[PDB]
Amino acid sequence: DIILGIRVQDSVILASSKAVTRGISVLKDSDDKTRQLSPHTLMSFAGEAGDTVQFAEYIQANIQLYSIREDYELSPQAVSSFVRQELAKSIRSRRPYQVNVLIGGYDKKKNKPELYQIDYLGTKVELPYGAHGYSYTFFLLDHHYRPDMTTEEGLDLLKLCVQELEKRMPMDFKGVIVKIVDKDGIRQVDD
Amino acid sequence: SSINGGIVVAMTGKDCVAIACDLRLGKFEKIFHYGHVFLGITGLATDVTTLNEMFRYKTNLYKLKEERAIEPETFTQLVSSSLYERRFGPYVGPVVAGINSKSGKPFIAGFDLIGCIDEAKDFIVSGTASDQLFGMCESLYEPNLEPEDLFETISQALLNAADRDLSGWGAVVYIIKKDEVVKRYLKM
Amino acid sequence: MQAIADSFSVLVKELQYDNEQNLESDFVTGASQFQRLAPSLTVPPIASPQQFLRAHTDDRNPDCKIKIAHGTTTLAFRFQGGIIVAVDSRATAGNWVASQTVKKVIEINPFLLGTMAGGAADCQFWETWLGSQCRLHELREKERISVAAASKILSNLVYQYKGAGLSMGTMICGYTRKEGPTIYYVDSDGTRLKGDIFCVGSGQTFAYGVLDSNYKWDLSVEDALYLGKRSILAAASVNLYHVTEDGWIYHGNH
Amino acid sequence: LKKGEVSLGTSIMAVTFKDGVILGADSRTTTGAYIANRVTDKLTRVHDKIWCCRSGSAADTQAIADIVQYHLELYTSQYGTPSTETAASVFKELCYENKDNLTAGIIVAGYDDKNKGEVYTIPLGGSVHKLPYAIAGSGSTFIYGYCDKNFRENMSKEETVDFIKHSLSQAIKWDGSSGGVIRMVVLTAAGVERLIFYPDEYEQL
Amino acid sequence: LKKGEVSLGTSIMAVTFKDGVILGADSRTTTGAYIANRVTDKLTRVHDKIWCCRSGSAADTQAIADIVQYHLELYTSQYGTPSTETAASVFKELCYENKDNLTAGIIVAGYDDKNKGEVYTIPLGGSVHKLPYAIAGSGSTFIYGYCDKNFRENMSKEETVDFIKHSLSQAIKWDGSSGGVIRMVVLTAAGVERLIFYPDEYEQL
Amino acid sequence: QFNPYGDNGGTILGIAGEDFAVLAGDTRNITDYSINSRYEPKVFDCGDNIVMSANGFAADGDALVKRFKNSVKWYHFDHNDKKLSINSAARNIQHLLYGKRFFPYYVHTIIAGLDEDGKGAVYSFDPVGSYEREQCRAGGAAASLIMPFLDNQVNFKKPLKYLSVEEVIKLVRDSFTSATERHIQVGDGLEILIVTKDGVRKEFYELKRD
Amino acid sequence: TQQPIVTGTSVISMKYDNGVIIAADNLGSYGSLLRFNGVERLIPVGDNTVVGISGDISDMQHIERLLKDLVTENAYDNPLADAEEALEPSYIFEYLATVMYQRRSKMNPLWNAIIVAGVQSNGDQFLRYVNLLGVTYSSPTLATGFGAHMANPLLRKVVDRESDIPKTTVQVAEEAIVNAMRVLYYRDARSSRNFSLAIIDKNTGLTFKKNLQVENMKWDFAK
Amino acid sequence: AGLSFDNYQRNNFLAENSHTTTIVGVKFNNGVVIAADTRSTQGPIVADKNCAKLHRISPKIWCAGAGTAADTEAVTQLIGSNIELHSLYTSREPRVVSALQMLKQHLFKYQGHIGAYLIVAGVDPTGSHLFSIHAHGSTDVGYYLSLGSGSLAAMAVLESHWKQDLTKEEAIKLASDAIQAGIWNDLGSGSNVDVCVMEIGKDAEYLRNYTP
Amino acid sequence: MNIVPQDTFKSQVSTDQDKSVLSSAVPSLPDTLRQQEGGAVPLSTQLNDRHPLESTLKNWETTQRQRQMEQYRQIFGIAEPMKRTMEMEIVNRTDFNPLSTNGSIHRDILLNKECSIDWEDVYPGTMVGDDVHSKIEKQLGI
Amino acid sequence: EDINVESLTQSVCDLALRFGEGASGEERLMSRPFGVALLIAGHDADDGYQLF
């Protein structure tokens, strides 16, 4: 369960690895570790099985309800704050569960991309780039990151990071599903 | 290469004995002989090999000094003493079978890990499970059987035990009379 | 006011029969215990029920131990016009004689199937419950329930008891007109996956390799059945189920 | 017994004599090896002629005693002076119904015009026993035989005073948690009488 | 003590009187709640007029008693009859040098021409105390006050016999590890006398 | 921590014929190495020609039997005194067992009767509820000493279908006598209930402990 | 609770040809200390039932309160409570067994062993045993604690099986019970010399004997 | 030399890694009787239905044991060898007190690690003797003793019917009845009864299967 | 006659124990969206790892009230607890203030807490629910 | 098993009785009685074809 998010000048790129289960062989083409919160806000999650998907679907249902009720789209900041509040409320009276969330959006009012990361305790931090899973790659991002990079440069950096992760992984690392959030909405890259 | 554990069954027929041990197929047998006495050891493989070497040593010295082969009762006492020597570091389940060269009576016995002797007039089962095989032997056992009948009974018991939990399962059976010992293999 | 007077009027307390649940469970006031759509499960009235159950479930009569479905190889794949579900009929030794083959596959409906791959009692009970729920939904909506809906219902149910002690992993396979043939995997940890090929059991890597060698969408019924039988044999008496839009059909070895 | 609480390790006695009852105790409260309070009045009163002595946990016993005094005030408002049996029953019910949460033991002495003085003991657990005399506490174990060899029915007031004084002096002598002065309450038809005996008087016995 | 090891839950009383010493005990050996032996001879003879009673581990006390008897035989082979002080010193040395591995406690009652009968007590740990009288065991805790109140110096033989009988009867009554018969050994200048008392005798005191 | 469970030993055996069923059990209630009772039945007639036996913790088995009997009584009250089938009874027992999933009964259950067609039927239940229909089932701490005897002296493929009730009774008696000889717990009596279209018949035999 | 604090030891009961006999000693021990003497551990319920309880004394008193409440409620509002509408021993035992099992299932059991003895209306003897786990069983002879290991063989020597019940007179059963109590006093550290006995006979009714002492003590084989 | 401690650490390592009766003695006016049951069980399973639990230390000194069977047998055999050598050295009939001392010292040497609980009966020129020996080295003297899992029923029977002056026949009957009660009322006891009677001035009489 | 509350643990559980919040598509399952608890809170987690004092504090005044009612029944009769409970029930049922949670003055007068403060008084303490209509439905049972 | 038609009809009538006290003693569920009449047609093995 490894998730990455890179924010470039005009868009946000989110990459997620194929979900696997212990002792179970599955062949499918789907993204079950990512939910589209809104046409311009995407969410990726990684953590314990069961709880994480329930939390993600709960968040998606709440955000869709708000969008229908108000006939308007929430900003990425408001979405991230709501997710943080709900995550803090979830472990209010129970043992905390492992979960890490990357939220990437394109604020139309500010006309700029944004990316946030929330850990299992409910700590929301705005980041230029972020990753979770294997604990290697932060040095590669640091040496090859610029705030004014284009989409193609971000995709090249993501390809380099994916190759580096695959090399260390014992060849069990399958493909990576890549999505781009920008002014035109959310799309998936099949390259 | 795991070879720890096994099943050894000893039965007494009219004027004979039968001692059988499980195999693994896919060169390591658990039955050894020191003349007209047979010993089957179940448990840790290293302890089985150590006991085999030690008993070969002691039986060779006994034959050199006494100028005669050791009797099954004397060998039983020797095995009990050797097992009790390692009281705080004990090794397994040994089974002794044979026919006395003078009286001609069959003899079978079993041991615990510190040499407590259990002399059975009917049969002895040694192994890890020792529940399904014990029940099958109890149901199939009849006193005073001929060597052919005894062989059939013990082979049927082993086959029934094998059926209720393989590809590489085998068995070695010894039918021991006063003047002849027959060794046979069962391939299930 | 009469109820208040009766509450402070004076044996039943020691019997704990002043509570509705105790009377209902002991079949005192009627057979309302066997009329609950959502069953009620007894929990020890202690601060640590989960640890109590875990400690007492690992302690030594073989007959009084919770039966566990054997980790036999189970396979499922959707080729063009149905779902092939393949299991191995290799019985285990025991102190009993079977009048028929072991039912390693649960028949939810004339259109749905499931696999145990876990605890036997949990799988049987909750898949019968899921069948009842699907029947009620079909009566209400006058249309066959989607496989996604049934899998989601089962997943929510097993998630509500997550961590309590349930242990079950099932494969819900179904062919509907709107969706086509679909296979979902539902785990006792709340996991719910959708897939085209599923292999589980003690040995499934070999079966998955055999499938990947000779899998394609443009198969046929006979070819798919042969592929499933070959995969089960290679992973090692191969029971097959072919699911089409009209329901499931069982084959002993063909 | 919850960790860090205060234990009522003491020497409690109650003796029934011809004209009523006498309840006696020491005055030492210790926390480990340190005497926290060397002047303690352990003769708790729950009614005008119904007294008790407590053991176990101080907080639980005080709460139970307060509730029992409340109950007896309600009873007196309704029906009048209660008998010692009623107070003992209330004590027993309170101790038994909460024995999984509270550790408490009581010795109840009482007097009334009908029964003419009675002694009841509720040990840990909640059982009740009616005895001609009772002893309790950590220091009681050393005087058992003595108390079995010098008790007579229908003793006079002075004989009972001397018996209680000697027994409590021995218990104080042999127990580390028993010491200080001896406090005795005499309940008879005349009224309630208080007696205090200092170490220099009972240590010479 | 070790797991599964027999413990000596006895009642021991040694009293010095004008003409010598008397050592008495009960006869019960228990296994927690089951009485293994209703009649036991707990009075161990180390020398002709030097006896002892044992508490703690049975095996350790028996080994110590055997070694002390052997030592006293060796001493007698050289210098004649030993003294109670010598036997107490040997017991104390054996118990103290081995207290890290053996659990043992002894009460020694002796007589000699020089000292005219003496009592020594060696509790757990290995310290020797010379006392006019000594009590030990599980039941001894119930007769501390009684023995303290009813002990006199230079009593007669019958007075000491009655004192020990009453005290041991109370100890047997209040303790579950004390048995039926009472065995007493009187060591005086005339010789060694053995007395036995049955429950039907002392239970009616 | 209070331990709510226990064990009382005992052995039970259920066999299904072609037109009858047999359920037998040893009538000895024992705690650890002590005999509580030399005659305590563990097989009961639970209504409409159905015999039930729960072996293991005695209190749990008694509670389960009591609950099932009350459920049968209310079933008769609700539906015009309709006769309860063996499969419906099996599902009722499954629900009763699974209702205590997190505080399970410490018993193994066997029931016997006749199916709709009229053949003998035996159902076996694990402590949590899972059940299946079997030709023969042995429970308790003697099954490994009883099942091989039956497999040796009869075939379930002399075929079991051709056996009469007397032959089945003889086989059960012989197997239980052998178990009594070999096993300390088994003995002191054997009660057999035979279910046919005429009803339920009870027989008793004395084993080697008196 | 978690453990008994003041405890009773043993109750022994036997069946004879016309009724039942039960007995128990009068003692409450505080650990190894024999604390309370004069504790009645046999409860006469009705004119034909006797309940013997061994174990925690507080729980025994609670069960006594329950039995008294049951007896009082039986007369409400039956005008024939002394008549054929009295309480049979089977009713009392069923109620007690239900209570014990319900409290066991609630993780707050009553640490007691209970023996119910009596004679039914038709004259059949009743003798049942229940414990803190709710385990119930019947036998011609019953005992609790150390009685279950020592007095039980002595009683079974008399009434070995069901066929021996008609052959046993009341004198033989009473003598056997007295001998078993003497053996228990010999070999039980927590036992007491004083005990109570109850005889329930279908002809003579209920006979309750108190302040019975163990006699014929053999201690002379010492020296 | 002596008992070995080799592979103790290996055995502990394997263990951490998941790699794994009624006897009575009755003293009568001119001797002693020792009786025992004859069932050997390997847990629930009855291994042997006729086993001799009466072992002999000396021609007129017998014993019966419980606990660890191998330890009991080995200690009895060693004490028998020592007693025979002592009798040959002294040219005198062995005494039960000598056997008691040897057993006590040997058991105390190993500090309870040799599990053997014994009833030892015998007759020597000084009289008849009956002792009970614990595994830690503590010994006790009594007139009637019981041992094993069925010892409570046997003790009840002995307490019921014991007197000071008993004849040989009465003592034999009492021992047989105690063993029978243990057999019937205890699951670990069964089968037949073995008896050994020892008088003063007469040979020991050993009766196997006295009551079948 | 209890001082510390007892029997605070659940004896049975089910997926439809919370009758107020149940799904409409599947009435046998709870409605996660309208619970508004976090979306990842199964009911089983509420049965383990709770503070021991939480149950004692949550039901403490109720236990004292019940003990007082029992004392009144023992000393005064059935009429006194009957009247007290009747008055309290009338006062509780008449009040309906969807915009507030603070109790009425008459309730405090009946409870004899006119001049008493506890931490409950000092500390009286979405997308869906928590509106007037939900409280109306809960009160009226529709 | 299939439920008898009479059993289902009795259950429906017990539900219809909810404007007052229920069959098992439950409190009232609805303010007014139903305004519907039902014709229930079924088939079971016990009583063949039935109309209620």
> Which domain does B138 fall in, by range?
1-188
Residue H74 to residue H59: CA distance in whole angstroms:
18
Tokens 């786990």, residue?
G133
Residue G6 and residue G58 in contact, taking contact as beta carbons nearer than 8 Å: yes
F143: left (phi over 0), alpha (psi -120 to 50) or beta: alpha
Longest pairwise C-alpha distance within chain G = 67
CA dihedral C208, C212, C215, C221 (to 10 degrees): -20
Sign of the dihedral through C-alpha G33, G34, G36, G41: positive
Q: CATH no. for residue C154?
A: 3.60.20.10
d(C-alpha I89, C-alpha I67), whole Å = 18
Q: Pull the structure tokens for residue A15.
A: 């990459």
Q: What would the 3-class secondary structure string for H65-93 be? A: EEECHHHHHHHHHHHHHHHHHHHHHHCCC
Taking the CA atoms of C176, C178, C180 and C184 in sequence, report the sign of the dihedral they define: negative
Structure tokens at D145: 């035989």
What is the CB neighbour count within 10 angstroms for residue B117? Answer: 19
Tokens 């080799």 found at: H6
**Omega of the bond prior to G77 within 30 degrees of 0, cis?**
yes
CA distance B77 to B82: 9
In what helix (H) or strand (E) does residue A36 lie, and over which residues does it extend? strand A34-38
Alpha carbon distance G14, G174 (integer Å): 9
Count Cβ atoms below 10 Å from residue C145 Cβ, excluding itself.
Answer: 22
The DSSP H or E segment spanning C131 is helix C120-141
Domain positions in chain E are 7-205
Smallest Cα distance from C46 to chain G, Å = 8
What Cα–Cα distance (Å) separates residue B139 from each residue in B134, B135, B136, F10, F189? 9, 6, 5, 21, 21
A155 near A176, Cβ under 8 Å?
no
Residue I15 identity (one-letter amino acid): T
The C-alpha atoms of residue I101 and residue I114 are separated, in whole angstroms, by: 17
State how far the Cα of D202 lies from the Cα of D194, in Å rounded to an integer. 17
Phi, psi of I8 (to 5 degrees): -95, -5
Name the domain count of chain G.
Answer: 1
Spatial CB neighbours of E21, under 8 Å, sequence gap ≥ 6? E14, E15, E109, E110, E111, E117, E118, E119, E186, E187, E188
Burial G172-184 (b: 16+ CB within 10 A, else e): ebbebbbbbbbbb
**Residues ≥6 apart with Cβ < 8 Å to B4:** B43, B44, B45
Q: What is the dihedral of CA H103, H104, H108, H110, to 10 degrees?
A: 10
Domain count for chain C: 1
DSSP D165-201: HHHHHHHHHH-TT--S-EEEEEEESS-EEEEEE-HHH
Count Cα atoms within 13 angstroms, Cβ side, for H205.
Answer: 15
Rounded to a whole number of angstroms, the distance from the CA of H162 to the nearest CA of chain G is 9
CA of G152: how far to CAs of F34, G144, G180, G217, H191, in Å? Answer: 10, 9, 8, 21, 20
Handedness of CA H147, H153, H157, H159 (dihedral sign): positive
Contact between F13 and F193 under an 8 Å Cβ cutoff? The reply is no
Interface contacts (C, I; CB < 8 Å): 88
Tell me the one-letter amino acid at A96: P
φ, ψ at I49 (rounded to 5°)? 60, 60
Nearest CA of chain F to the CA of B161: how many Å?
Answer: 10
Residue H203 backbone dihedrals phi, psi, to 5 degrees: -65, 150
Determine the 3-state secondary structure of C54 from DSSP.
helix
Please name the CATH architecture into which domain E7-205 falls. 4-Layer Sandwich (3.60)
Domain assignment present for C50: no
Query: Is residue E85 exposed (0-12), middle (13-18) or buried (19+ Cβ within 10 Å)?
Result: middle
**Is A94 within 8 Å of chain C by CB?**
no
Q: Which residue in the block uniquely carries the two structure tokens 């004069």?
A: G38
What CA–CA distance (Å, rounded) separates F129 from F123? Answer: 11
Residue D199 tokens read as 């170490």
Q: Please tell me which chains touch J, using 3 or more CB pairs under 8 Å as the contact test.
A: C, F
Q: Searching chain F, which residue's CA lies closest to the CA of residue C67?
A: F126
Q: Phi first, then psi: what are they for B83, rounded to 5°?
A: -65, -40
Kindly give the residue spans of alpha helices, DSSP state H, lying in chain F: 58-78, 86-98, 143-153, 165-182
- Expressed as residue numbers, the domain containing F130 is 1-210
Alpha-carbon distance of E178 to E26, in angstroms, equals: 6
Residue B98, strand partner residues: B37, B107
Strands E29-30, G19-25: parallel, antiparallel or unpaired by DSSP? Answer: unpaired
Do I72 and I81 contact (CB within 8 A), yes or no?
yes
Q: Answer whether B145's CB lies under 8 Å from B137's CB.
A: no
Which chains are adjacent to chain E, needing at least 3 Cβ pairs under 8 Å? D, G, H
Token digits for F203? 């027989």
**Residues in Cβ contact with H125 at an 8 Å cutoff, skipping those fewer than 6 apart:** H93, H95
Neighbours of D136 (CB within 10 A): 23
Token code pair at residue E86? 């010598």
CB spacing of H153 vs G153 below 8 angstroms: yes
Where does chain D show beta strands of DSSP type E? Answer: 12-17, 20-25, 29-31, 34-37, 44-47, 50-56, 104-110, 118-122, 129-130, 133-136, 182-188, 192-197
Is residue C172 within 8 Å of residue C183, measured between CB atoms? yes
Nearest by CB to G135, from F6, F34, F38: name it: F6
Distances (CA, A) of C56 to F104, F176, I50: 10, 31, 21
* Cα dihedral: D83, D85, D91, D92 (round 10): -170
Among A64, A139, A55, A142, CA closest to A101: A55
Residue among D2, D8, C11, G2 at smallest CA distance from I56: D2
Please enumerate in sequence order all residues whose Cβ is within 8 A of that of B27, keeping only pairs 6 or more positions apart, or say none: none
Q: Quick one: three-class SS letters along A53-105?
A: HHHHHHHHHHHHHHHHHHCCCCCHHHHHHHHHHHHHHHCCCCCCCCEEEEEEE
Count of positions (residues) in chain H = 212
Q: Identify how many contiguous H helices and E strands chain J contains and give both numbers.
A: 1, 2
CB of D36 closer than 8 Å to CB of D92? no
Closest approach of C140 to chain A, Cα-based (Å): 25
Residues 6+ apart with CB under 8 A from H85: none
C-beta separation of C71 from C116 below 8 A: no
Task: Sort out which chain C residues have CB atoms less than 8 A from F138's CB and list them.
Answer: 95-96
Distance CA(A58)–CA(A51), nearest Å, equals 11
Give the three-state DSSP class for F205. strand
Per the CB < 8 A criterion, the answer to whether B164 and F174 are in contact is: no
Q: What is the CATH number of the domain that holds G215?
A: 3.60.20.10
What tokens appear for B42 in the block?
Answer: 């179940």
In chain B, how many domains are there?
1
Number of H helices, E strands in chain F: 4, 11
Report how far residue H156's alpha carbon sits from residue H174's, in angstroms, rounded to the nearest whole number: 11
C11 in contact with G, Cβ within 8 Å: yes
Binding-face residues of I in 112-141 toward C, CB within 8 A: none
Is residue G196 within 8 A of residue G26, CB to CB? The reply is: yes
> Which DSSP letter does residue D205 get?
-
Interface test with B, best of H12, H39, H40, H42 (most B CBs within 10 A): H42
Which residues of G are known catalytic residues? 1
Touch between chain H and chain F (3+ CB pairs, < 8 Å)?
yes
J23-27: Cβ within 8 A, 24+ apart:
J24/C29, J24/C30, J24/C32, J25/C29
Number of alpha carbons in the 13 Å side-chain half-sphere of residue C148: 7
CB spacing of H6 vs B120 below 8 angstroms:
no
The secondary structure of F13-35 as a DSSP string is EEEE-SS-EEEEEE--EEETTEE
Which residue of chain C comes nearest to F122, CA vs CA?
A: C99
Helical (H) or strand (E) element with B37? strand B37-42
Helix, strand or coil, per DSSP, at residue A19: coil
Say if residue G71 is exposed, middle or buried (CB neighbours under 10 Å; 0-12, 13-18, 19+).
Answer: middle
Residue A188, judged by CB atoms within 10 A of its CB (0-12, 13-18, 19+), counts as: exposed
* Nearest CA among A180, F132, F130 for reference residue C121: F130
Total Cβ atoms within 10 A of residue C99: 15
Task: Check CB contact of A61 with chain C, cutoff 8 Å.
Answer: no
Of these residues, C29, C57, C72, C244, which one is catalytic? C72
Angle (CA) H39-H45-H48 rounded to 5° is 35
Q: What are phi and psi of A155, to 5 degrees?
A: -65, -40
Helix (H, G, I), strand (E, B) or coil at A48: coil
Q: What is the CB neighbour count within 10 angstroms for residue I121?
A: 12
Q: Which chains touch B (3 or more CB pairs under 8 A)?
A: C, F, H
CATH number at residue B85: 3.60.20.10
Which residues of chain A make contact with I49, given a CB cutoff of 8 A? 94-95
Reported as type and span, the H/E element at residue G30 is strand G27-30
Rounded-to-integer distance, Cα C96 and Cα A146, Å: 72
Domain with G108, as residue range(s), is 1-223
Known binder of ligand: residue C120?
A: yes
Q: Cβ H4–B88 below 8 Å, yes or no?
A: yes
Cα–Cα distance for residue pair G59/G130, rounded to 1 Å? 14
Query: Cα D191 to chain center, whole Å?
Result: 18
